[PDB]
Scaffold this active site. Structure first.
Site, PDB file in Angstrom:
ATOM      1  N   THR A  70      39.199  38.626  19.623  1.00  0.00           N
ATOM      2  CA  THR A  70      38.852  37.754  20.886  1.00  0.00           C
ATOM      3  C   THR A  70      39.169  36.874  21.204  1.00  0.00           C
ATOM      4  OG1 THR A  70      37.148  36.657  21.781  1.00  0.00           O
ATOM      5  CG2 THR A  70      36.830  37.117  19.851  1.00  0.00           C
ATOM      6  N   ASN A  97      47.153  39.248  30.161  1.00  0.00           N
ATOM      7  CA  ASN A  97      46.815  39.537  31.744  1.00  0.00           C
ATOM      8  C   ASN A  97      45.331  39.680  31.382  1.00  0.00           C
ATOM      9  OD1 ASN A  97      44.777  42.857  31.934  1.00  0.00           O
ATOM     10  ND2 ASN A  97      45.913  41.419  33.655  1.00  0.00           N
ATOM     11  N   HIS A  98      44.723  38.947  30.039  1.00  0.00           N
ATOM     12  CA  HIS A  98      43.088  39.182  29.528  1.00  0.00           C
ATOM     13  C   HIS A  98      42.301  37.773  29.880  1.00  0.00           C
ATOM     14  CE1 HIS A  98      44.837  36.388  26.694  1.00  0.00           C
ATOM     15  NE2 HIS A  98      43.332  36.198  26.266  1.00  0.00           N
ATOM     16  N   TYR A 161      36.481  30.151  36.852  1.00  0.00           N
ATOM     17  CA  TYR A 161      37.584  31.216  37.074  1.00  0.00           C
ATOM     18  C   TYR A 161      38.939  30.945  37.744  1.00  0.00           C
ATOM     19  CZ  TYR A 161      39.522  36.081  38.173  1.00  0.00           C
ATOM     20  OH  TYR A 161      40.753  36.849  38.155  1.00  0.00           O
TER      21      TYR A 161
HETATM   22  N1  LIG Z   1      40.361  43.211  39.163  1.00  0.00           N
HETATM   23  C1  LIG Z   1      40.706  42.676  40.424  1.00  0.00           C
HETATM   24  O1  LIG Z   1      40.183  42.687  41.572  1.00  0.00           O
HETATM   25  C2  LIG Z   1      41.948  41.058  39.933  1.00  0.00           C
HETATM   26  C3  LIG Z   1      41.903  40.364  41.237  1.00  0.00           C
HETATM   27  C4  LIG Z   1      42.802  39.078  40.786  1.00  0.00           C
HETATM   28  C5  LIG Z   1      43.350  39.170  39.235  1.00  0.00           C
HETATM   29  N2  LIG Z   1      42.816  40.182  38.556  1.00  0.00           N
HETATM   30  C6  LIG Z   1      43.417  39.819  36.857  1.00  0.00           C
HETATM   31  O2  LIG Z   1      43.778  41.336  37.032  1.00  0.00           O
HETATM   32  C7  LIG Z   1      43.417  40.774  34.654  1.00  0.00           C
HETATM   33  C8  LIG Z   1      42.590  41.686  34.340  1.00  0.00           C
HETATM   34  O3  LIG Z   1      42.059  42.261  36.076  1.00  0.00           O
HETATM   35  P1  LIG Z   1      41.056  43.085  35.451  1.00  0.00           P
HETATM   36  O4  LIG Z   1      40.656  43.169  36.539  1.00  0.00           O
HETATM   37  O5  LIG Z   1      41.957  44.586  34.899  1.00  0.00           O
HETATM   38  O6  LIG Z   1      39.803  43.242  34.671  1.00  0.00           O
HETATM   39  P2  LIG Z   1      39.464  44.121  33.300  1.00  0.00           P
HETATM   40  O7  LIG Z   1      39.497  45.673  33.943  1.00  0.00           O
HETATM   41  O8  LIG Z   1      38.110  43.776  33.105  1.00  0.00           O
HETATM   42  O9  LIG Z   1      39.849  43.649  32.039  1.00  0.00           O
HETATM   43  C9  LIG Z   1      40.009  42.618  31.193  1.00  0.00           C
HETATM   44  C10 LIG Z   1      40.558  42.964  30.116  1.00  0.00           C
HETATM   45  O10 LIG Z   1      40.464  41.400  29.171  1.00  0.00           O
HETATM   46  C11 LIG Z   1      39.584  42.522  27.541  1.00  0.00           C
HETATM   47  N3  LIG Z   1      38.855  41.009  27.303  1.00  0.00           N
HETATM   48  C12 LIG Z   1      37.722  40.608  28.026  1.00  0.00           C
HETATM   49  N4  LIG Z   1      37.296  39.630  27.600  1.00  0.00           N
HETATM   50  C13 LIG Z   1      38.579  39.574  26.211  1.00  0.00           C
HETATM   51  C14 LIG Z   1      38.202  38.275  25.299  1.00  0.00           C
HETATM   52  N5  LIG Z   1      36.772  37.751  25.670  1.00  0.00           N
HETATM   53  N6  LIG Z   1      39.643  38.603  24.326  1.00  0.00           N
HETATM   54  C15 LIG Z   1      40.489  39.270  24.701  1.00  0.00           C
HETATM   55  N7  LIG Z   1      40.260  40.252  25.207  1.00  0.00           N
HETATM   56  C16 LIG Z   1      39.436  40.349  25.847  1.00  0.00           C
HETATM   57  C17 LIG Z   1      39.467  42.906  28.630  1.00  0.00           C
HETATM   58  O11 LIG Z   1      38.832  44.336  26.810  1.00  0.00           O
HETATM   59  P3  LIG Z   1      38.120  43.845  26.531  1.00  0.00           P
HETATM   60  O12 LIG Z   1      36.300  43.743  26.555  1.00  0.00           O
HETATM   61  O13 LIG Z   1      37.774  45.311  25.305  1.00  0.00           O
HETATM   62  O14 LIG Z   1      37.696  42.769  25.246  1.00  0.00           O
HETATM   63  C18 LIG Z   1      39.931  43.738  28.743  1.00  0.00           C
HETATM   64  O15 LIG Z   1      40.855  45.227  28.747  1.00  0.00           O
HETATM   65  C19 LIG Z   1      43.055  39.214  35.086  1.00  0.00           C
HETATM   66  O16 LIG Z   1      43.740  38.400  34.492  1.00  0.00           O
HETATM   67  C20 LIG Z   1      42.361  38.736  36.275  1.00  0.00           C
HETATM   68  O17 LIG Z   1      42.393  37.628  36.832  1.00  0.00           O
HETATM   69  C21 LIG Z   1      42.308  41.311  38.657  1.00  0.00           C
HETATM   70  C1  LIG Z   2      36.470  37.816  43.480  1.00  0.00           C
HETATM   71  C2  LIG Z   2      37.408  39.763  43.037  1.00  0.00           C
HETATM   72  C3  LIG Z   2      38.101  40.576  44.551  1.00  0.00           C
HETATM   73  N1  LIG Z   2      38.618  38.742  42.340  1.00  0.00           N
HETATM   74  C4  LIG Z   2      39.455  37.983  42.694  1.00  0.00           C
HETATM   75  C5  LIG Z   2      39.930  37.745  44.377  1.00  0.00           C
HETATM   76  C6  LIG Z   2      39.417  36.221  44.744  1.00  0.00           C
HETATM   77  C7  LIG Z   2      39.240  35.228  46.133  1.00  0.00           C
HETATM   78  C8  LIG Z   2      40.313  36.657  47.081  1.00  0.00           C
HETATM   79  O1  LIG Z   2      40.532  36.326  48.295  1.00  0.00           O
HETATM   80  C9  LIG Z   2      40.744  34.154  48.456  1.00  0.00           C
HETATM   81  F1  LIG Z   2      41.400  34.577  47.740  1.00  0.00           F
HETATM   82  F2  LIG Z   2      40.864  34.331  49.901  1.00  0.00           F
HETATM   83  F3  LIG Z   2      39.175  34.321  48.877  1.00  0.00           F
HETATM   84  C10 LIG Z   2      40.465  37.835  46.758  1.00  0.00           C
HETATM   85  C11 LIG Z   2      40.343  38.011  45.424  1.00  0.00           C
HETATM   86  N2  LIG Z   2      40.380  37.273  42.173  1.00  0.00           N
HETATM   87  N3  LIG Z   2      40.219  37.705  40.569  1.00  0.00           N
HETATM   88  C12 LIG Z   2      38.972  38.501  40.978  1.00  0.00           C
HETATM   89  C13 LIG Z   2      37.936  38.818  40.136  1.00  0.00           C
HETATM   90  C14 LIG Z   2      36.631  38.173  39.690  1.00  0.00           C
HETATM   91  C15 LIG Z   2      36.248  37.038  39.806  1.00  0.00           C
HETATM   92  C16 LIG Z   2      35.797  36.724  39.735  1.00  0.00           C
HETATM   93  C17 LIG Z   2      34.173  37.280  39.338  1.00  0.00           C
HETATM   94  F4  LIG Z   2      32.953  36.892  39.097  1.00  0.00           F
HETATM   95  C18 LIG Z   2      34.369  38.364  39.634  1.00  0.00           C
HETATM   96  C19 LIG Z   2      35.324  39.350  39.880  1.00  0.00           C
HETATM   97  C20 LIG Z   2      39.073  39.765  38.750  1.00  0.00           C
HETATM   98  C21 LIG Z   2      38.408  41.000  40.000  1.00  0.00           C
END
Ligand SMILES: NC(=O)c1ccc[n+]([C@@H]2O[C@H](COP(=O)([O-])OP(=O)(O)OC[C@H]3O[C@@H](n4cnc5c(N)ncnc54)[C@H](OP(=O)(O)O)[C@@H]3O)[C@@H](O)[C@H]2O)c1
Ligand SMILES: CC(C)n1c(-c2ccc(OC(F)(F)F)cc2)nnc1C1(c2ccc(F)cc2)CC1
Ligand SMILES: NC(=O)c1ccc[n+]([C@@H]2O[C@H](COP(=O)([O-])OP(=O)(O)OC[C@H]3O[C@@H](n4cnc5c(N)ncnc54)[C@H](OP(=O)(O)O)[C@@H]3O)[C@@H](O)[C@H]2O)c1
Ligand SMILES: NC(=O)c1ccc[n+]([C@@H]2O[C@H](COP(=O)([O-])OP(=O)(O)OC[C@H]3O[C@@H](n4cnc5c(N)ncnc54)[C@H](OP(=O)(O)O)[C@@H]3O)[C@@H](O)[C@H]2O)c1
Ligand SMILES: NC(=O)c1ccc[n+]([C@@H]2O[C@H](COP(=O)([O-])OP(=O)(O)OC[C@H]3O[C@@H](n4cnc5c(N)ncnc54)[C@H](OP(=O)(O)O)[C@@H]3O)[C@@H](O)[C@H]2O)c1
Ligand SMILES: CC(C)n1c(-c2ccc(OC(F)(F)F)cc2)nnc1C1(c2ccc(F)cc2)CC1
Ligand SMILES: CC(C)n1c(-c2ccc(OC(F)(F)F)cc2)nnc1C1(c2ccc(F)cc2)CC1
Ligand SMILES: CC(C)n1c(-c2ccc(OC(F)(F)F)cc2)nnc1C1(c2ccc(F)cc2)CC1
EC number: 1.1.1.146
Lengths: 253, 257, 264, 264
Positions: A70, A97-98, A161
């Site tokens: 973790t 990435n986590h 976040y």
């Molecule tokens: N999905 C989106 O719409 C979105 C949008 C913008 C940015 N992102 C970025 O994408 C990245 C991951 O996105 P995701 O959406 O694919 O997230 P995710 O699927 O929920 O996965 C996050 C990863 O982190 C691991 N993790 C969670 N807590 C942890 C901890 N305390 N220590 C170590 N590992 C941990 C989780 O695995 P375990 O629970 O097994 O530890 C999982 O593999 C993040 O940096 C996020 O900011 C995603």
């Molecule tokens: C809210 C979501 C879509 N998002 C975003 C995101 C934030 C703002 C976005 O649009 C704008 F920037 F314009 F607000 C688009 C995506 N970034 N990480 C996220 C995630 C997320 C962040 C916070 C959360 F509580 C649940 C999910 C990782 C999926």
């Protein structure tokens, strides 16, 4: 680089992907697998990780190993790099990435979520980075930082976040400059992602597909790009760029 | 939206006001001003000696009331209590002016996680504890929160990564709630101030370019805070100041909203 | 669609080219650079004397060919006939460089509407006429059109209203058709040249920190050579960075979908 | 510098306003609004028949006064007499609304130099003549000039090259006179209006089946324009798509003008 991306840039590279159990991080692990790199994947889910790995072997990874932990544990993170660079004999690419789990929620007074967010989503990144540096300097290697729109612009329901994502930017950009004169040759790639169609994101909430998202992150890192953009909307992506900022930086250089 | 009227020193009359990092540099001068506007101030910092020497000059410049507490914003526990004791000491709050930051020097980053950590604690988290702790009083008073920041909180610059990160974090944070407040009709002003080089004693020490003077700056901070402005730029350079704005961003936010 | 590799002086060797107002300043220089790369060349302006010198000196430097035709671009009949005649003399055309302008001084604008009209006629209208007369031959060689402009053709500046108006017009008209040629698949490229102060006897006699006319010209030529949508040149890296407009490229290529050109 | 403080309909009551191209579209709507606000009004355009309807409605609607004077802005003499005549009919002038354009249609450009000349004549040069003729009155009332432009007058677009050249042309000309007024300390505001697709009959006639963007409502369009004028703003941005309306202003430009501003 002046290049175009081609799969083979990763062939035989030693890659770390954190947060690799599900979502984008996994996809990335798989892509790298397909491209035959050495990969070390981490996250908390011991039993899920083992399975990601097996899948990585079938896909044709140079090799694939896991270390469960973790990222709240700064110690675990120092030692993970140590260990991982042992399993691969070095390191070309550190993919940070986590994230810690959060919710769409109004901030009343949830301080402990803020602190944690800042440790998992930002501090662990610095620590991993610091441990990963001598070897990346070896390989003239690369650091990939996964962020989001919300690390560039304001949004509600995600103050903790954004605070942390905004932080990655501040710190790695400034670090980028630093290396850009100590002539240290590690690239630093900050990825800005729009909604991606990940289980966790979808169950928390238009979504871009995770499979292509992951690859776009890998492309940007291999091309040594400063920033990567990726969103379901082209409108969205053109705009995320910030010209006014580039000028200012160069102006003050 | 920045309450539409040109500034007026009267706005700061009987307004209950905290200033942190108020012991020296910009923090001091912010206090002074507020005093010469007849506002109740409560300044905090560490050096109680220098803080005494600050409350004094306040009163004899016409501050309604001027008290002091002395502590470390490394101490979250402390900060939370300082805001109560301060609100008890003035029976209310209209302006929270977070302004302190740990000490840093100009340096290549390379190994100092300690510093990265201390900075995120004192520069960023502290500000979030004060705020939470000030929220009830500010909700009743429909008042203001002011967060001081820097060019380095908007753009990348070498030698100060720990710093920039803490400052980049504030923006991300407070702008995030700003909008939460908006869709909660919650009536609290959030003001982030982007400051280029300012001539302060400590700042000038370790930069050995163009120094904008502390006076107009603190003034500027207040104007903006009362004026209820979203942000407030201020550099010795007009040329930069208008592009250091970020139209790019104002869109997308307002766009998605 | 700009190029896929960097500029070599040889790309102009035996290229047929027209330069307007080439009897002095940036125009005269463009001409010299060209002869000095062995291009064929027709230059024009009103003054035959000075044009004679440009032509001779041009031979001295390795011009595949060098000739002139004297006239005023106040006259669209000339403009039209001039291009044919230059096209005939050379047996084609690879690059057209529109560079002339009408004489102008710095003054507040009052009521001199004649100056505004002439500015539009000479600086802008003629450029269009010339383009019309030249396109068939340009389509033929997949050549380039280069339009020489000014900062004051992108931002507002006092003392130059008529002048500025016309330069704005140039960007307006030529950016529009450039996109036009895009989708009718015409392979003539168009380069617009945004120039700060250049040290030409005329510029200097008129008006601050001049960039050298000699370089301006080469870059202009390089710009058109490398088929770039815009060339910026100014003695201030700073300014040259503030010149571009990202917003504009954005909404140009947003709205880039609101149309289909098939009725054509 | 727009009037710090907010718009109220009465700002216009009693004000003597010319509106051109005021027989159809935005122009009519502008007449009407001004009619409601109790303004003196003089509309103009070519078809007197339709100009008479407008004059009726404005009188019924409450104008303090209302006339038309018909004529084509192809004729600079007229454009110039008009203002004199309109001034005569109102005893002065507070605001000039420059709005008319020549009939034009979505087409690739080919060799229609006339279309291009007519556009510069009608959509640009007449504006200048009209303006010159009004300045002396506007000066007296610290009045305002309102110029109506398009997005095609800020960003390139195919099929409207002649149109676009002339609208660009306005920006360069009025933006430079604008500065000139600052320095010369002339106090007449100059407002440039930058519109997207507005739902006018002609417009809709013209872009239907070829273009598919969102038309904004001509009534509201009209009123945005007057306020912009009344508030002495430099630019008025108006589009249906609030995206668009936001990234349209250019700050690099404001910067560049500022640099070269106080530092000549
Ligand atoms: N999905 C989106 O719409 C979105 C949008 C913008 C940015 N992102 C970025 O994408 C990245 C991951 O996105 P995701 O959406 O694919 O997230 P995710 O699927 O929920 O996965 C996050 C990863 O982190 C691991 N993790 C969670 N807590 C942890 C901890 N305390 N220590 C170590 N590992 C941990 C989780 O695995 P375990 O629970 O097994 O530890 C999982 O593999 C993040 O940096 C996020 O900011 C995603
Ligand atoms: C809210 C979501 C879509 N998002 C975003 C995101 C934030 C703002 C976005 O649009 C704008 F920037 F314009 F607000 C688009 C995506 N970034 N990480 C996220 C995630 C997320 C962040 C916070 C959360 F509580 C649940 C999910 C990782 C999926
Ligand atoms: N000066 C500039 O050019 C510049 C530029 C950009 C932004 N800024 C912003 O301006 C604000 C003020 O900067 P400044 O230059 O005025 O700084 P400064 O003069 O050095 O003052 C720092 C203040 O914070 C207090 N402080 C120090 N450590 C503290 C701690 N651990 N806990 C609580 N308070 C502490 C100090 O008092 P004690 O030491 O006695 O505790 C002092 O009052 C800062 O937030 C900075 O981000 C300044
Ligand atoms: N130099 C600068 O500071 C500067 C800045 C921005 C943009 N530019 C652009 O660069 C280009 C060249 O400028 P320059 O400084 O080199 O000007 P220049 O030296 O004065 O040259 C003007 C040329 O055009 C010709 N010309 C003048 N009137 C004409 C007419 N009525 N018909 C046909 N030709 C005519 C002139 O020759 P004749 O009079 O003998 O006919 C002369 O050869 C122009 O487009 C200008 O807008 C220059
Ligand atoms: N509607 C849009 O989608 C849109 C978008 C961007 C900008 N604009 C601008 O908004 C303004 C008004 O546009 P609109 O759509 O309302 O157009 P419109 O409805 O067609 O208005 C044209 C007006 O100009 C007059 N006119 C035409 N030729 C003339 C001439 N030769 N001399 C004098 N008057 C003449 C017409 O009456 P007569 O023919 O009887 O003279 C009519 O009054 C124009 O400046 C246009 O560039 C419109
Ligand atoms: C480095 C200095 C100029 N600065 C800045 C700053 C302002 C403009 C800058 O330029 C740019 F815009 F490029 F960021 C960079 C840093 N912000 N806070 C500071 C201060 C500072 C920060 C850290 C430090 F170690 C020493 C001083 C607080 C004085
Ligand atoms: C006025 C001069 C400086 N200038 C310019 C010019 C370039 C940049 C300028 O700065 C700014 F960017 F602010 F517009 C202003 C004018 N472009 N062509 C010119 C010239 C010119 C034009 C008109 C005139 F009356 C006298 C000279 C052609 C030499
Ligand atoms: C083409 C049309 C939409 N348009 C515009 C216009 C508005 C926005 C546009 O979008 C952008 F500029 F972004 F491309 C393009 C053109 N301005 N005046 C017009 C009008 C027009 C001009 C010329 C024409 F041939 C037919 C119609 C007056 C209707």
């Amino acid at each position: 680089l002046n290049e175009e991306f081609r799969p083979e840039m990763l062939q035989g590279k030693k890659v770390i992907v954190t947060g690799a159990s599900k979502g984008i991080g996994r996809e990335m692990a798989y892509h790298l697998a397909k491209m035959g790199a050495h990969v070390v994947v981490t996250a908390r889910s011991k039993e899920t990780l083992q399975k990601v790995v097996s899948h990585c072997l079938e896909l044709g990874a140079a090799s694939a190993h896991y270390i469960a932990g973790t990222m709240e544990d700064m110690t675990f993170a120092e030692q993970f790099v140590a260990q991982a660079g042992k399993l691969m004999g070095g390191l070309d690419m550190l993919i940070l990435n986590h994230i810690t789990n959060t919710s769409l929620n109004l901030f009343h007074d949830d301080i402990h979520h803020v602190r944690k967010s800042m440790e998992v989503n930002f501090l662990s990144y610095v620590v991993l980075t610091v441990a990963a540096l001598p070897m990346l300097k070896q390989s003239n290697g690369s650091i990939v930082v996964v962020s989001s729109l919300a690390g560039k612009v304001a949004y509600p329901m995600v103050a903790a976040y954004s605070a942390s994502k905004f932080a990655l930017d501040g710190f790695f950009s400034s670090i980028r400059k630093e290396y850009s004169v100590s002539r240290v040759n590690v690239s630093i790639t900050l990825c800005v992602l729009g909604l991606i169609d990940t289980e966790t994101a979808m169950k928390a909430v238009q979504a871009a597909p995770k499979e292509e998202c992951a690859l776009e992150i890998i492309k940007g890192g291999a091309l040594r790009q400063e920033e990567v953009y990726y969103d379901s909307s082209l409108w969205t992506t053109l705009l995320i760029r910030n010209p006014s900022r580039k000028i200012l930086e160069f102006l003050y250089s």
